[PDB]
Enzyme design. Structure first.
Site, mmCIF file in Angstrom:
data_model
loop_
_atom_site.group_PDB
_atom_site.id
_atom_site.type_symbol
_atom_site.label_atom_id
_atom_site.label_comp_id
_atom_site.label_asym_id
_atom_site.label_seq_id
_atom_site.Cartn_x
_atom_site.Cartn_y
_atom_site.Cartn_z
ATOM 1 N N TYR B 27 -30.205 0.495 -24.963
ATOM 2 C CA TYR B 27 -30.539 0.085 -26.365
ATOM 3 C C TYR B 27 -31.357 -1.171 -26.577
ATOM 4 O O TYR B 27 -31.723 -1.488 -27.714
ATOM 5 C CB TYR B 27 -29.221 -0.117 -27.156
ATOM 6 C CG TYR B 27 -28.531 1.209 -27.338
ATOM 7 C CD1 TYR B 27 -27.747 1.756 -26.325
ATOM 8 C CD2 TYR B 27 -28.707 1.947 -28.505
ATOM 9 C CE1 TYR B 27 -27.152 3.009 -26.473
ATOM 10 C CE2 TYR B 27 -28.121 3.199 -28.663
ATOM 11 C CZ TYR B 27 -27.342 3.722 -27.647
ATOM 12 O OH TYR B 27 -26.742 4.943 -27.797
ATOM 13 N N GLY B 29 -34.723 -2.531 -26.477
ATOM 14 C CA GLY B 29 -36.128 -2.241 -26.298
ATOM 15 C C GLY B 29 -36.479 -0.784 -26.450
ATOM 16 O O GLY B 29 -36.851 -0.315 -27.525
ATOM 17 N N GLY B 31 -36.074 2.991 -27.039
ATOM 18 C CA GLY B 31 -35.178 3.758 -27.897
ATOM 19 C C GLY B 31 -33.697 3.605 -27.613
ATOM 20 O O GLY B 31 -33.080 2.622 -28.034
ATOM 21 N N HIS B 47 -27.703 -3.113 -33.059
ATOM 22 C CA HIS B 47 -28.895 -3.523 -33.672
ATOM 23 C C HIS B 47 -29.813 -2.353 -34.042
ATOM 24 O O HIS B 47 -30.515 -2.394 -35.056
ATOM 25 C CB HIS B 47 -29.574 -4.526 -32.774
ATOM 26 C CG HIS B 47 -30.928 -4.883 -33.351
ATOM 27 N ND1 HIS B 47 -32.094 -4.496 -32.776
ATOM 28 C CD2 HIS B 47 -31.227 -5.596 -34.478
ATOM 29 C CE1 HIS B 47 -33.082 -4.954 -33.531
ATOM 30 N NE2 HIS B 47 -32.580 -5.617 -34.567
ATOM 31 N N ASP B 48 -29.779 -1.321 -33.221
ATOM 32 C CA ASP B 48 -30.544 -0.106 -33.480
ATOM 33 C C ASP B 48 -29.956 0.633 -34.677
ATOM 34 O O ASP B 48 -30.686 1.185 -35.512
ATOM 35 C CB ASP B 48 -30.531 0.808 -32.257
ATOM 36 C CG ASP B 48 -31.326 0.237 -31.096
ATOM 37 O OD1 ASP B 48 -31.984 -0.813 -31.268
ATOM 38 O OD2 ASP B 48 -31.293 0.844 -30.007
ATOM 39 N N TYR B 51 -30.918 -0.932 -38.025
ATOM 40 C CA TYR B 51 -32.259 -0.533 -38.421
ATOM 41 C C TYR B 51 -32.270 0.853 -39.061
ATOM 42 O O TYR B 51 -32.946 1.075 -40.067
ATOM 43 C CB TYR B 51 -33.181 -0.557 -37.202
ATOM 44 C CG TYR B 51 -33.897 -1.874 -36.986
ATOM 45 C CD1 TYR B 51 -33.336 -3.085 -37.409
ATOM 46 C CD2 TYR B 51 -35.135 -1.911 -36.351
ATOM 47 C CE1 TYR B 51 -33.998 -4.299 -37.203
ATOM 48 C CE2 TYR B 51 -35.801 -3.116 -36.136
ATOM 49 C CZ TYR B 51 -35.232 -4.302 -36.563
ATOM 50 O OH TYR B 51 -35.901 -5.477 -36.341
ATOM 51 N N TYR B 67 -39.889 -10.585 -43.520
ATOM 52 C CA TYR B 67 -38.876 -11.181 -44.368
ATOM 53 C C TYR B 67 -38.986 -12.698 -44.343
ATOM 54 O O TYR B 67 -39.848 -13.256 -43.663
ATOM 55 C CB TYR B 67 -37.482 -10.718 -43.929
ATOM 56 C CG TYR B 67 -37.249 -10.785 -42.439
ATOM 57 C CD1 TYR B 67 -37.255 -12.005 -41.769
ATOM 58 C CD2 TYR B 67 -37.010 -9.625 -41.699
ATOM 59 C CE1 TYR B 67 -37.026 -12.076 -40.399
ATOM 60 C CE2 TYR B 67 -36.780 -9.684 -40.323
ATOM 61 C CZ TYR B 67 -36.788 -10.917 -39.682
ATOM 62 O OH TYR B 67 -36.543 -11.000 -38.331
ATOM 63 N N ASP B 93 -31.545 -8.420 -37.550
ATOM 64 C CA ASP B 93 -32.104 -9.270 -36.509
ATOM 65 C C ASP B 93 -31.276 -10.520 -36.260
ATOM 66 O O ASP B 93 -31.027 -10.896 -35.110
ATOM 67 C CB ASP B 93 -33.529 -9.678 -36.874
ATOM 68 C CG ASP B 93 -34.504 -8.526 -36.789
ATOM 69 O OD1 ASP B 93 -34.150 -7.492 -36.192
ATOM 70 O OD2 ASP B 93 -35.632 -8.658 -37.306
#
Lengths: 5, 119
Positions: B27, B29, B31, B47-48, B51, B67, B93
């Protein structure tokens, strides 16, 4: 250029 | 956005280049999909997911959304001016970065075969 998570 | 996420990582985890987290476990970087190899992989997994939920907000693109946030004297802060989407992304993030700072780092889990250890 690119993606961490 | 990932430029900002990059900068977030760089201010909570000084000693370690952000690259160290761009290709880790299943996970971080790349996919993902499958059981997180470890805590640091779990941080990314969460984190994925964050998103994906954010993606539910229409016109919200976790990777390209810019942002409002700041990092000073060891404090990562998501500002109040952010709309629902930016706020969500920011906090995703932010939570991740803080998670990264408290998790162990295993080198064996850096750049593992994705295809064979994650479908």
């Amino acid at each position: 250029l690119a993606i961490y998570s | 956005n990932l430029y900002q996420f990059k900068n977030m990582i760089q201010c909570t985890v000084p000693s370690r280049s952000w690259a160290d987290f761009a290709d880790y476990g299943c996970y971080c970087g790349k996919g993902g999909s499958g059981t997180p190899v470890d805590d640091l992989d779990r941080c990314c997994q969460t984190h994925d997911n964050c998103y994906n939920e954010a993606e539910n907000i229409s016109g919200c693109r976790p990777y390209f959304k810019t942002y409002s946030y700041e990092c000073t004297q060891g404090t990562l802060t998501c500002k109040g001016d952010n709309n629902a989407c930016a706020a969500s992304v920011c906090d995703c993030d932010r939570l991740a970065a803080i998670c990264f700072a408290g998790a162990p780092y295993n080198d064996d889990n850096y750049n593992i075969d994705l295809k064979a250890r994650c479908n």
